[PDB]
Structure 1
Amino acid sequence: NLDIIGKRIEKIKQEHETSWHYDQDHPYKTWAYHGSYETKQTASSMVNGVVRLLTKPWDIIPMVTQMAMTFKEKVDTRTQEPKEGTKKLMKITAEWLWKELGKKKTPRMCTREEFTRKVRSNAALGAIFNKWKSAREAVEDSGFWELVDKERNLHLEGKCETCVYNMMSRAIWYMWLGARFLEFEALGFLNEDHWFSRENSLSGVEGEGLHKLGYILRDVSKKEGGAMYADDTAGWDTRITLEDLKNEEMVTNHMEGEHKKLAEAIFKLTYQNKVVRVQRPTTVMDIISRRDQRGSGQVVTYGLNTFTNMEAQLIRQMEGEGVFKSIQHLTVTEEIAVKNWLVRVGRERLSRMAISGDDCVVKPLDDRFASALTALNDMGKVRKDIQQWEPSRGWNDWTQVPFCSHHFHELIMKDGRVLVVPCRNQDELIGRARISQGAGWSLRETACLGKSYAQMWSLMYFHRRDLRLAANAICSAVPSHWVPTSRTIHATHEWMTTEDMLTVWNRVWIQENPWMEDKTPVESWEEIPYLGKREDQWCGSLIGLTSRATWAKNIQTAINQVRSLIGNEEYTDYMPSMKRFRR
């Protein structure tokens, strides 16, 4: 308790010694409270005018227009201790899983060099603004690194002074850039060296672009077994137990020397003991602590969520298959049965899953899995929008399964080749492309963000009539040589390029498609297929509406409207690519 977190608390106390007051009307129940101090400050969602001017029919669709307008009661909940049988199942499975992930990988420290490069190419690290302005300025100043070094030698000493979270079904915990470095130096190898790639982890998808996920689900569907289960957890990050954090820390058993000590300190001092500062409107700053739940960098959060989700789903599979009888207690021969199951079929059972942090798809050996709920509920991983003990609804067709906010279509090209494409309701896609975040956007920067969305649509959603037309319109309206932009884990985004989108389509869906037999490149957009016209409406297309009718016929007008506002620039017409405009 206060021996590990006291120093951090002590230090913040003295920076606001004029204000420190143990408030009596504090709202926290499951968070330990410590004191309050005086502050006074808060980042709303702004409209992208280039995208909105070129999507006029959606100006009257509330599911689009409402997205641009406008639970911290769940972070203040408690998760009961799992039973002894459950704690033993998790320890055996975690020990086995780290071993498997480590067979072809070597834990290693990430470097100042590596960290610096990441700051200079814009990444969502979750730092704050204070002595230096941006991350860019702190990383070039030698002062920073002496603060980093002092903390670093404190961690080797088993102590912490400045690794403090700043709070803001979401909750992002910003830290200062120095604490973010020490986290990256010790644990960044999990992401930098792709420990959760599908090649390495068999269940994972790390590095897989949206164009691979449908093919991966179709491959899981080819396995013999029961329904495909895709159960969402209610507030995954809030249900991470201290038992989970101890199984995650076992990655340090694979480390040596300095690295081992630095990683042990990240887990013990900052993950298994947190200090947080929260804005209350009643405006004070509350200094609160707790031992459990997930509050780490976003990228480490993704890899450890993937790990613990892989562990939980193997255990739910063991329960369905009758490997153990009760979570109350594992007998000695049940332990050896669990171990022997892992050794004999663990890798096969990982390959029946697609896991992206808290998001999973599982094709179990049979449907006993649907009612195998005791371990899942006792680990705290309670399913969303179903009653605790109600059996899971499975999906009979891989093309209906939700994963990473998408579903996937099987689409046959006029030449017989098969595409498996990503899809979601088109209102969600259009509504998201019409939104910017942050201040000080020039017209050029707004246009280049519009162009990023357009190129994404050409590569991923070319099969949606409205998006291919709107993408061609935005690319026609933005100067041809202007570079697509975005402010700041992600798989590589191949739409982020000034390369000819048609040449990218050919390499992504044909040349470098490990699922595609024939490597013959496509020599015209008009060869590339759409979904069915009825399947497009189902997925939220405005095809058929008079609003969409004129918008299409008269798009050249909207394209030229935008061209005039950006100004005298080289513009290309990509609409003639459309069969409708193509004579």
Structure 2
Amino acid sequence: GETLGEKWKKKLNQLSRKEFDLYKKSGITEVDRTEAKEGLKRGETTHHAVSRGSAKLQWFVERNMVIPEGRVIDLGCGRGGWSYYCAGLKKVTEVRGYTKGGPGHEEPVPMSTYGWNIVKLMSGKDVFYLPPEKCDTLLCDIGESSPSPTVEESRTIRVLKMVEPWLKNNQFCIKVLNPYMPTVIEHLERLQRKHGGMLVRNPLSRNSTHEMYWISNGTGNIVSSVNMVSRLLLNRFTMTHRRPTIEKDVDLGAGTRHVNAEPETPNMDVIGERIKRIKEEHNSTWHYDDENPYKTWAYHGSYEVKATGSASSMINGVVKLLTKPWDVVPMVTQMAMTDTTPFGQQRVFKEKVDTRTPRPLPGTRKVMEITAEWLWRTLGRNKRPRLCTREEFTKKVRTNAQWDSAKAAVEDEEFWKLVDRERELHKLGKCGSCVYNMMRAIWYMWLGVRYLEFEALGFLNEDHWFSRENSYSGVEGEGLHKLGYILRDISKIPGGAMYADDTAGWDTRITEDDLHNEEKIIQQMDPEHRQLANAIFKLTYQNKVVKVQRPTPTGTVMDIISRKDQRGSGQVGTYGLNTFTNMEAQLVRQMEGEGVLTKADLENPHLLEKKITQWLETKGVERLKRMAISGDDCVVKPIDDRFANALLALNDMGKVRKDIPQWQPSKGWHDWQQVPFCSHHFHELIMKDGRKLVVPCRPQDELIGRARISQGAGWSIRETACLGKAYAQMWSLMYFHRRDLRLASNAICSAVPVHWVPTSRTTWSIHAHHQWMTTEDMLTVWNRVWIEENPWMEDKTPVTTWENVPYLGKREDQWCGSLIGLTSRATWAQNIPTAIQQVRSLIGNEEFLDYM
């Protein structure tokens, strides 16, 4: 008789328009298309997925249900979501899209996303009038819905009969609009006997459609899976309404794809021993997956592993309810949906890490060489490089700036025996166990590899090589409270505007030549030190072996991959080396801006050195003082504004700017208070004394958003509060000028016990000196930071009350996201005594004293 899909249909068509509206998305997975749909309106052709379809297809490609390869044919491509996504897949060489177009139908949208040069979409091409072509991958998403099941039925069969002749021992993913009608089930079964595969439900599909997808890589009972969907959809009628799960939309990159230029060539004599050891520490589940996704990293093998990560983050209770208005604001409640699930990370690797930078021109390479040799010499004018020791490393661990096996390990004499063993390999130019991650005690191998880095390259951070005194451009050991002052001093330097261009994924943009230039520091080292440093550079920085997780349809596996260039982001002195190359890169760009370095010079194979040496030796230091370089973050105030147009060398060096077309001139500021740097801008405040403060500031919502997050007590109240009181005291020392934050700060500290220890990292930022931890009176701590220890505060007159500590002007406070003025803020302002009384009751009966 009647099928469960048909019962579902009849009941779907009986819902009210508002009962259907809720059912349509109850418990489904959706994609955030807001950013993409406004990029499309602004006519942007990069990064954006052209429709919801790219994310839909991704779900299948993720689980290898279909693995597009060779020539891909996309029947009914529409705007081209599936076609644009396939263009960036490893084994894909060509994509052809056929769609009907015309009135009432989707026309393909031209894009410049990565691999556009192998995509060919055509309108005026009805596939039901089209002779089948040879292809290695057949996609089809055609399915015109209907409130009549039997109408949907014949439409589905029409699609099926159309599409069958395209199938011939090739990959395929085909939408089956209505799969529960008996005759379709019948036809699918005959199809499954001939071409194999299986029907699968996509979680991104709305509950208002029964659509399933016939994919080639799978086997299973058709009737069973269809009826499972039927029950699920039928269940979601009566289940209490669930707000859909929201994913982050796909990033399809930009630029042409040269498939032959992607594959990595591994130095097996360098990385072989490391692989071998991984292989036999996990020999029981070790295998080689030919279906690995890596385009530009060299794959070596895999072993099985239990899954790690979450799609969302644990919210802090104490703050969440002391900040009731922000329960509703989107920007705050969104930084929880960061996803570190195997899927989430494999997505990140594809779009951000699995890329390859073209080798810079010979002229560009010479410039970087000359500049680096000079820069290194400048950085070592007073200091010598030095080795760091076990004693030094151990002390740094015990001052744990919970990684707690860290303090156990260094005390283990057995741990250091392994370290010694590995060091003797490095002296012979070999590496056995230096592998890092992206996320039986293999833990020792990893704390040991970090130490050896620290031993050889730790001096850069510990001896403050990139402090402002030593590097002019640098800002190491300064802190948020000092950064804004440095920007204000820079603005006093005559010239062009202040430019702050962010590189897109800096660490992935580090090149072979960058690595070879940072390496030059070893020339200043003692022999025994150079030996160890040369081992670090050559064997582990220029030959990286990485463990990375990957979800598969039969479990999670750990992939072992390798890469010669790029930067290992989890390495010692990543900050310093980033700062160095960025300093060099910005000097290079200043030369081009000043006309010293021309297009002819970058292309010219033998660039005469005399010109660049002269510029550096006469102007270099002055130009370094025009900059503030913190790792990959820079602020540059050149001698004029030609710099904004100086783009040849910067792009050729691989340091492509973020969120701007590759050849569009940079836009800078002349108001230094609007310059972004280290995730902040900096306001100048006038105390009613008359003296001036330069405070750090940022969008208030991302300050509040971070503080509604634990790290990570599940579920400990007498520890989740101590994280909140840490934020609350940071807000007091650093963001006192914000009205909501300072008020919220007084609402937290009065709600949390007086001498309860504040722990856990607030932010692990290099410029966060964390001097807000002591359970000391905040005004006295504030006074030491902003008055007596402040070099830019001449009059050391102390502050006796919190009303001599200024705010931002209401206008400027509001512009930075403050909710003052909104009456919900007012109701919140007079309800925080209760909210305070709430958590104090939620904690218990202990030492409170009021900051109300």
The structure having more radius of gyration, on CA atoms, is 2
The match for 1:344 is 618
8 Å CA contact retained: 2:362, 2:606:
no
Structure 2 unaligned blocks of 5 or more: 1-266, 339-347
Distance 1:62 1:549 in 2: 20
Q: Of 519, 531, 536, which residue of structure 2 is paired with 1:249?
A: 519
Matched, 1:456 2:730: yes
Answer yes or no: is 1:68 the counterpart of 2:342.
no
Contact 2:731–2:745 (Cα < 8 Å) also in 1? yes
**C-alpha distance in 2, partners of 1:141/1:375?**
50
Partner of 1:394: 668
Specify the alignment match of 2:481 in structure 1: 211
State the partner residue of 1:18. Answer: 284
Distance 1:175 1:386 in 2: 42
| 1:190–1:300 contact (8 Å) kept in structure 2 | yes
Decide whether the 8 Å contact of 1:46 with 1:438 is kept in 2: yes
2: CA distance between counterparts of 1:451 and 1:298? 31
**Structure 1 residue matching 2:602: 3-state secondary structure:** coil
Residues 116-127 of structure 1 correspond to what in structure 2 (within 5 A)?
Answer: 116-123=394-401
Among 416, 420, 423, which residue is 2:694 paired with?
Answer: 420
What pairs with 1:255-270 in structure 2 (closer than 5 Å)? Answer: 255-270=525-540
Corresponding residue SS for 1:515: coil
Q: Alpha carbons of 1:178 and 1:299: their partners in 2 closer, same or farther (altered >3 Å)?
A: closer
CA offsets 1:367-391 (integer angstroms, 9 cap, x no match): 1101111110111001111111111
CA contact (8 A) 1:298 1:489 kept: no
How many Å separate the matches in 1 of 2:574 and 2:687? 39
1:5 aligned onto 2:271? yes
Q: Is residue 58 from structure 1 mapped to residue 329 from structure 2 by the alignment?
A: no
Q: Distance in 1 between matches of 2:406 and 2:770?
A: 23
Moved more, 281-290 or 370-379: 281-290
SS in structure 2 at match of 1:527: coil
Q: 2:423 aligns with which of 152, 156, 159?
A: 152
Cα distance between partner residues in 2 of 1:89 and 1:535: 44
2:182 corresponds to 1:182: no
- 1:359: how far off? 0.7
Match of 2:584 in 1: 311
Q: CA deviation at 1:200?
A: 0.9
Cα displacement string for residues 293-324 of structure 1 (whole angstroms, at most 9, x for unaligned residues): 00053551111111000000000001111112
Match of 2:595 among 298, 307, 322: 322
Q: What SS does structure 2 have at the residue aligned with 1:63?
A: coil
Contact 1:271–1:296 (8 Å) recurs in 2: no
Q: CA offset at residue 28 of structure 1?
A: 1.2
**Cα distance, 1:330–1:353 mapped onto 2, change above 3 Å:** farther
* TM-align CA RMSD: 1.8
Deviation, 1:54, is 1.2
Hey, what does 1:558 align to over in structure 2? 835
Q: Deviations over 1:156-197 (max 9, x none)?
A: 1110010012222xxxx9971110111111111111111111
Match of 2:802 among 525, 549, 564: 525
Cα separation, 2, equivalents of 1:61 and 1:23: 44
Residue aligning to 1:468: 742
| Residue matched to 2:372 | 94
Give the Cα separation in 1 of the matches to 2:515 and 2:334.
39
Residue among 560, 565, 568 paired with 1:287: 560
- Give the AA of the match of 2:573: V
Normalising by structure 2, what TM-score? 0.64
- 8 Å contact 2:713–2:720 — kept in the other structure? no
8 Å contact kept, 2:507–2:569: no
Matching residue of 1:302: 575
Query: Residue 538 of structure 1 corresponds to which residue in structure 2?
Result: 815
Match of 1:40 among 282, 286, 306: 306
Change (3 A) 1:100 1:174: farther
**Structure 2 counterpart SS, 1:149:** helix
Which structure carries more relative contact order (alpha carbon 8 Å, separation 6+)?
Answer: 1
DSSP-derived class of the 1:279 partner: strand
**Pairing 1:358-377 to 2, within 5 Å after superposition:** 358-377=632-651
**2:514 partner SS:** helix
* 1:37-62 deviation per Cα after TM superposition (whole angstroms, max 9, x unaligned): 22222144211111112111211212
- State whether structure 2 residue 630 is matched by structure 1 residue 356: yes
Match for 1:328: what amino acid? E
Aligned residue among 798, 806, 824 for 1:547: 824
Contact 1:13 1:20 in 2 (8 A): yes
Which residue identity does 2:583 align to in structure 1?
M
Report the Cα offset of residue 329 of structure 1: 2.2
State the alpha-carbon separation in 2 of the partners of residues 531 and 165 from structure 1.
44
Per the alignment, do residues 69 and 21 of structure 1 end up closer, same or farther by CA in structure 2, a change over 3 Å counting?
closer
Q: Matches of 1:537 and 1:57 in 2, distance apart?
A: 15
Counterpart in the other structure of 2:766: 490
Q: Percent identity?
A: 78
